[PDB]
């Protein structure tokens, strides 16, 4: 855990796609989330009760990490990707959002650069992914299929 | 709910594998998590606000149950088991971790005994399960498959 | 610094004051905090196979 947490950040999209579990494992487990799960009492805890302001700040940090995690999982579920780090969809690429070939982006761009190129199309793409899944379920409820 | 919560604890691994929903259902639902979800206000709540230390202790207990649940679910997701109480993997058994035949462990050992036999190989096994899933995804991204 | 001085071209430096925050800026200048955003999308040749 955290042995190369953002190690692929400067690498290409292709190479970086091979380290996806590395970042996923660090979204729900900060130091305080490890101390909170010791078999022994952590001892510190009395401090956070005697002084309730510190107790509240710690809980807010823990609750937020959980809420952010769950929201990303909910979107993957809605889009039809329950689990999987990499999933294919039926939404075609518009070639307006970005107009580059596969041999250019997977080999020459980093994920940070990509993110800064299509950031204002994010909501359009997410909207289409949701519509696609709804259409798929409508087709599933037809026993003659395709 | 809680009608035989650890009832299989003294039973064999084989028999105990048939009660897995019994323990799973009790990880997110303690008494306070039921009172918190009443249609009526619980009434007690004012106590936990007037005296903020008790309010904080209760939240810490609730947040922790959620964090522990989610961490186990994240590991199952990483290992390629989204959902399912029982899942098969591609990691071979080493016969060093434990060197017993199937007819000995499934019929004669309890899960508590098993846990005390291979506890210091837990991290090795978990590491291998993650590597296995990453290798599987690398193979999935090949349209000629196997 | 005081400001400019004369045509002799000199500068005068004095011990300064300022907010206590300048003491922390001397140690934390190397650090930045960022939020990690794990989802993203990109073009590929795969298509969900409907089964």
């Amino acid at each position, epitope marked *: 855990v955290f042995l190369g947490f953002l190690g692929a950040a400067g690498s290409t999209m292709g190479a970086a796609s091979m380290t996806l579990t590395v970042q996923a494992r660090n979204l729900l487990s900060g130091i305080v989330q490890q101390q909170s799960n010791l078999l022994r009492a952590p001892e510190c805890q009395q401090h956070l009760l005697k002084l309730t302001v510190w107790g509240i700040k710690q809980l807010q940090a823990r609750v937020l990490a959980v809420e952010r995690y769950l929201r990303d999982q909910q979107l993957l579920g809605i889009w039809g990707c329950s689990g999987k780090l990499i999933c294919c969809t039926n939404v075609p690429w518009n070639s307006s959002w970005s107009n580059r070939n*596969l041999s250019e982006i997977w080999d020459n761009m980093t994920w940070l650069q990509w993110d800064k190129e299509i950031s204002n199309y994010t909501q359009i793409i997410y909207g289409l992914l949701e519509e696609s899944q709804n259409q798929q379920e409508k087709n599933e409820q037809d026993l003659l299929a395709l | 709910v809680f009608l035989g919560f650890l009832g299989a604890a003294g039973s064999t691994m084989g028999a105990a594998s048939m009660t897995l929903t019994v323990q799973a259902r009790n990880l997110l639902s303690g008494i306070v998590q039921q009172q918190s979800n009443l249609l009526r206000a619980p009434e007690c709540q004012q106590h936990l606000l007037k005296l903020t230390v008790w309010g904080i202790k209760q939240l810490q207990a609730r947040v922790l149950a959620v964090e522990r649940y989610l961490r186990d679910q994240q590991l199952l997701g990483i290992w390629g088991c989204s959902g399912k109480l029982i899942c098969c993997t591609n990691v071979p058994w080493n016969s060093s971790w434990s060197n017993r035949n199937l007819s000995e462990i499934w019929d004669n050992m309890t899960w508590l005994q098993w846990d005390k036999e291979i506890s210091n190989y837990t991290q090795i096994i978990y590491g291998l399960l993650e590597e296995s899933q990453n290798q599987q995804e690398k193979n999935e991204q090949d*349209l*000629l498959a196997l | 610094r005081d400001g400019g001085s004369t045509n002799s071209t000199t500068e005068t430096f004095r011990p300064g004051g300022g907010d206590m925050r300048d003491n922390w800026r001397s140690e934390l200048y190397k650090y930045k905090v960022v939020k990690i955003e794990p989802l993203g999308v990109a073009p590929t040749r795969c298509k969900r196979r409907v089964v």
Partner: antibody, heavy 120, light 105 residues
Framework: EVQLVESGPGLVRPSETLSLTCAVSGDSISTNNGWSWIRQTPGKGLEWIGYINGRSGSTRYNPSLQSRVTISTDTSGNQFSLKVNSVTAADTAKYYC?????????????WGPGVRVTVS | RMTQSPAILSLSPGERATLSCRASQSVDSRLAWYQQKPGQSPRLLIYDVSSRATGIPDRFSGSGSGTEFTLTISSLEPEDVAVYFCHQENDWPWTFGQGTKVEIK
């Protein structure tokens, strides 16, 4: 970038096994899955024979030859080969060595010149 | 599992040539086209119905889905005399159509 060079008998008799090989230059065959054989038969057109996965040794064969063809590798020689049993006149064809790359990110082929084989 | 049509086209230089290919079963979007000149092994032109292979002139294009596909060559040149093949990439048998010829006069 690789080059594929086929070689083998240009004549096989009825009920004999036909054996063709392909050398690979420029890359390894112990990896790079998708080494394959393609047959071009006058009067029928193109069809696949099958392919091999250099990393595992597994193979897949077109059902018409499920009981007739073997594909295997010589990773030391960095060459691979095709053997078809019980060859008959109907199997006269131009045989090719090919490399098919098909992934989520790239698609390409490399073809060798092939071997024309007469079957009596 | 796919049939091309017509067996042969004969076109004037600069004219646009079109070849159709029909599947017996859906092949989704997994269709490739190849160009085989006499004495040559087939060259990949188009993959996934409309994506050009690296090194292919912009004369070449195509479209289609499911079972109905077309290969188009605009501004046809004498160097395009070849047999064009329709290749199925949506199933295990990977069949090919029979191949059609385009000749420039």
């Amino acid at each position: 970038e690789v080059q594929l060079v086929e070689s083998g008998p240009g004549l096989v008799r009825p009920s004999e096994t036909l054996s063709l090989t392909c050398a690979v230059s420029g890359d390894s065959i112990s990896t790079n899955n998708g080494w394959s054989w393609i047959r071009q038969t006058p009067g029928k057109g193109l069809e696949w024979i099958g392919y091999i996965n250099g990393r595992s040794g597994s193979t897949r064969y077109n059902p018409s030859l499920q009981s007739r063809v073997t594909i295997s590798t010589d990773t030391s020689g960095n060459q691979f080969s095709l053997k078809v049993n019980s060859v008959t006149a109907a199997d006269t064809a131009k045989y090719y060595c090919a490399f098919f790359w098909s992934t989520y990110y790239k698609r390409f082929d490399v073809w060798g010149p092939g071997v024309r084989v007469t079957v009596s | 599992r796919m049939t091309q049509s017509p067996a042969i086209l004969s076109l004037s230089p600069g004219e646009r040539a079109t070849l159709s290919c029909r599947a017996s079963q859906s092949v989704d979007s997994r269709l490739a086209w190849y160009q085989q000149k006499p004495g040559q092994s087939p060259r990949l032109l188009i993959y996934d119905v409309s994506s050009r292979a690296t090194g292919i002139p912009d004369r070449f294009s195509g479209s289609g889905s499911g079972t109905e596909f077309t290969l188009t060559i605009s501004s046809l040149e004498p160097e395009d005399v070849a047999v064009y093949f329709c290749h199925q990439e949506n199933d295990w048998p990977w069949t090919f159509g029979q191949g059609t010829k385009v000749e420039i006069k």
